[PDB]
Structures are given as C-alpha cells and as structure tokens.
C-alpha cells in the first residue's frame, strides 16, 4: 500500500493521497455567500486529508450559479475563508479552493441585476440549479437562458479569475483549483456542443481551449505555478455537456498545453455522478506521459481501486467525495480499514448541521 505515503503537490507536501473532493453543500449565508463558522468546523473536522479541495467557490458574483454557494470576491468573504484555512491549518491540513463561473447552470433571480446569466453562447444548459425559498430551503429550478458573452467581455472574465486567485492567496489557501469541469463557464467554452462562437473562442479546439489557457497563464501570472490546479471532466457526459466526436484527441490536446504551463496538478473527474464510460489504461497512460504535474483521480474510486493505479504510477492521488462526506476521518478508516458511516444524500445540500458536522470520526 502506498496510499498512505507523503506526496509533494506544487508548493505543498500532502502526508497522505486520500484527498477530499470538491463538494457543494450551499449552506453559506445569505445575503452575501458567506462563508460560516459551521463550514469552518466542517473543514476542520476533515484536516488529516491528504489535501482538502474546497466547495466550488465564486470568483464573482456573477459567477454565482447556486444559492448558498460562497464567493471570494467580496471583504467579507475573505475575512470569513481567512478563519476557515487558519482552521484546517491549525489541524496541521492543508486547503484548496475551487474557484468556478457556473455560467449558463444558473438563474437570473441571483444574477447581478437579476438578469440573464452569460456562457459562450446563446443556449439554454436544459438542467436545473439549486435555489432557496422563502424559508432558506434548498430548491431545485430549471436554468435561465444565457446570454452569450461578447468579445470584449472575455478579458473581464481572465480578471476575475485573476483576482480571485488573489484573495486566495490573502486568503490563506494553499492552492487553487480552476473549474474546467462539469458543464460550467470554463467547459462551456471547451465544449462544441455548448459552444457555437464564431470568433477565436469557437470552432477549433485551440479555439475552444482559448480562454481556459488564458485563465491558467494569468493565474499563473498572479501567483505561481506551483499554486495552481485546474479539474477537468473531458471524457463523457457531465451536467448536459459532453466533450465532442473527439474528446479524446482534444482532452490530449489540452493536457500538452497545460503542461507547459508546469502547473501544481491536474484533477480528472472521470466521470459524472450518473456513470459513464471508464478510463482504458492506455488513455491513462497517454495523460500521463503528457502531464509532469501530479494528477488526481476521482469518479467512484474504492480504496482498491486507488492503489491500484497509484501502484501502476498512472495517477499519484485520489479525490474522494461522497466518503468524505460522511467520514471526517477516512484517512483513519480507510488506513484501519475500519467501517464507514453510512451517507445522507437527503442532506448533501443545503440545511444546517443535519448531515453536515455531525457524522462521528471513529
Ligand atoms: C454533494 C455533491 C456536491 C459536489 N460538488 C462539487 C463541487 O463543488 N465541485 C466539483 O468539481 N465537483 C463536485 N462534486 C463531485 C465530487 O467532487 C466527486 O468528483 C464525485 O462525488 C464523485 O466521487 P465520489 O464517488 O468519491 O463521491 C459534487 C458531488 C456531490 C455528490
């Protein structure tokens, strides 16, 4: 076993490659999407993770696409992630944050001005949000029609991204993680089907990889490269989004480029939480011939299944969402190979402590 053994990720060292996954549970304050002192305890209770990837997080507000989501543009908000981070670092953890721009899976009653959300083009994702209702509870409601951005928008996007890193950094954070994944902006862009531009940003896969490369060089350019990770979700079908007729050809494609960029890690969500097709070794094989960095594995990764390929020197580190969830200590239990609390889906989003601080560690 070799899950258990330290790993250096860009300007850190994680201890362990039991990672936490990215996970959304909205239960930030509103108004303001606010970090809470529950989400701090949240995070705390997780510390012994190898890495701790953050809920995906707003680098504007009109990157907010889900109620009770937090942002990282805002004083307040950096002041509320500055005591989050202190938290798991006082724990000896260490904590990315997941930046993102939902993009067209959002809705315009949370839209700056209450307008419609913008995507690379003018087309509706056909999926539904998480919204509040009159008591705060969390509601499902079909995504708004988006606006398709304009040419002289996209410099404003890379800024945001830019800035958000910035507060990161102020912030506390050991690294940051872009969402190039699931159906949001930045897969909005990289993807044919939900991209239909004419300009330099559409057609061609340099094209459609266009902006996300210039949010990673900015990024870059703000922080360093060994602060920097990016997730992506280029095989399959995610939230309405697939990757075209040649995923595999461009997701190569993109690897190479980011590859020059020497960044931190590359997160591979292999695949949406309703299935999808697996990863051939071989393909695997092609990332990582292509990719200097470490890279993360997450779908519906076991324990056995993470050694496994970890022990083939495919990938160096596993995401684990759902477990982590319901377990706080997974490093203990997965090392102990002790029994797992059972999960609550019911209570994965929004609601309060119920589901959230309360799964016991061992
Ligand atoms: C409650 C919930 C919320 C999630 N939120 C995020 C998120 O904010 N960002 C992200 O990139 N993926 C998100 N995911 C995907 C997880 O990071 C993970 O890749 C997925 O749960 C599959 O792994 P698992 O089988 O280990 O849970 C979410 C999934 C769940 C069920």
């Given at each position: 076993?070799?899950?258990?053994?330290?790993?250096?990720?860009?300007?850190?060292?994680?201890?362990?490659?039991?990672?936490?996954?990215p996970?959304?549970?909205?239960?930030?304050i509103?108004?303001?999407?606010?970090?809470?002192?529950?989400?701090?305890?949240?995070?705390?209770?997780?510390?012994?993770?190898?890495?701790?990837?953050?809920?995906?997080?707003?680098?504007?507000?009109?990157?907010?696409?889900?109620?009770?989501?937090?942002?990282?543009?805002?004083?307040?908000?950096?002041?509320?992630?500055?005591?989050?981070?202190?938290?798991?670092?006082?724990?000896?953890?260490?904590?990315?944050?997941?930046?993102?721009?939902?993009?067209?899976?959002?809705?315009?009653?949370?839209?700056?001005?209450?307008?419609?959300?913008?995507?690379?083009?003018?087309?509706?994702?056909?999926?539904?949000?998480?919204?509040?209702?009159?008591?705060?509870?969390?509601?499902?409601?079909?995504?708004?029609?988006?606006?398709?951005?304009?040419?002289?928008?996209?410099?404003?996007?890379?800024?945001?991204?830019?800035?958000?890193?910035?507060?990161?950094?102020?912030?506390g954070?050991?690294?940051?993680?872009?969402?190039?994944?699931?159906?949001?902006?930045?897969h909005?862009?990289?993807?044919?089907?939900?991209?239909?531009?004419?300009?330099?940003?559409?057609?061609?896969?340099?094209?459609?990889?266009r902006?996300?490369?210039?949010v990673?060089?900015?990024?870059?350019?703000?922080?360093?490269?060994?602060?920097?990770?990016?997730?992506?979700?280029?095989?399959?079908?995610?939230?309405?989004?697939?990757?075209?007729?040649?995923?595999?050809?461009?997701?190569?494609?993109?690897?190479?480029?980011?590859?020059?960029?020497?960044?931190?890690?590359?997160?591979?969500?292999?695949?949406?939480?309703?299935?999808?097709?697996?990863?051939?070794?071989?393909?695997?094989?092609?990332?990582?011939?292509?990719?200097?960095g470490?890279?993360?594995?997450?779908?519906?990764?076991?324990?056995?299944?993470?050694?496994?390929?970890?022990?083939?020197?495919?990938?160096?580190?596993?995401?684990?969402?759902?477990?982590?969830?319901?377990?706080?200590?997974?490093?203990?239990?997965?090392?102990?190979?002790?029994?797992?609390?059972?999960?609550?889906?019911?209570?994965?989003?929004?609601?309060?402590?119920?589901?959230?601080?309360?799964?016991?560690?061992?």
């Amino acid at each position: 076993e070799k899950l258990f053994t330290p790993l250096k990720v860009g300007a850190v060292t994680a201890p362990n490659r039991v990672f936490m996954a990215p996970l959304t549970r909205l239960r930030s304050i509103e108004p303001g999407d606010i970090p809470t002192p529950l989400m701090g305890e949240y995070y705390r209770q997780r510390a012994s993770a190898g890495l701790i990837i953050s809920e995906a997080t707003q680098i504007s507000a009109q990157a907010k696409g889900y109620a009770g989501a937090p942002g990282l543009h805002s004083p307040e908000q950096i002041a509320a992630w500055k005591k989050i981070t202190a938290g798991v670092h006082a724990e000896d953890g260490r904590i990315a944050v997941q930046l993102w721009h939902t993009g067209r899976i959002s809705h315009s009653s949370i839209q700056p001005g209450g307008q419609a959300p913008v995507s690379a083009s003018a087309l509706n994702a056909n999926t539904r949000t998480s919204l509040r209702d009159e008591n705060g509870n969390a509601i499902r409601v079909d995504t708004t029609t988006p606006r398709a951005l304009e040419l002289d928008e996209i410099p404003g996007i890379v800024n945001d991204f830019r800035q958000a890193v910035a507060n990161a950094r102020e912030a506390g954070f050991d690294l940051v993680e872009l969402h190039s994944a699931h159906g949001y902006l930045l897969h909005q862009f990289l993807s044919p089907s939900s991209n239909q531009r004419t300009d330099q940003y559409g057609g061609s896969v340099e094209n459609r990889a266009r902006l996300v490369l210039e949010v990673v060089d900015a990024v870059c350019n703000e922080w360093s490269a060994d602060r920097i990770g990016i997730r992506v979700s280029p095989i399959g079908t995610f939230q309405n989004v697939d990757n075209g007729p040649n995923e595999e050809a461009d997701a190569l494609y993109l690897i190479e480029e980011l590859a020059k960029r020497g960044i931190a890690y590359l997160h591979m969500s292999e695949t949406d939480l309703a299935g999808g097709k697996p990863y051939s070794e071989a393909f695997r094989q092609k990332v990582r011939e292509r990719f200097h960095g470490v890279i993360i594995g997450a779908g519906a990764y076991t324990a056995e299944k993470a050694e496994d390929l970890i022990g083939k020197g495919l990938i160096d580190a596993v995401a684990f969402g759902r477990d982590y969830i319901a377990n706080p200590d997974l490093v203990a239990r997965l090392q102990k190979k002790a029994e797992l609390n059972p999960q609550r889906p019911e209570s994965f989003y929004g609601g309060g402590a119920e589901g959230y601080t309360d799964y016991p560690s061992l």
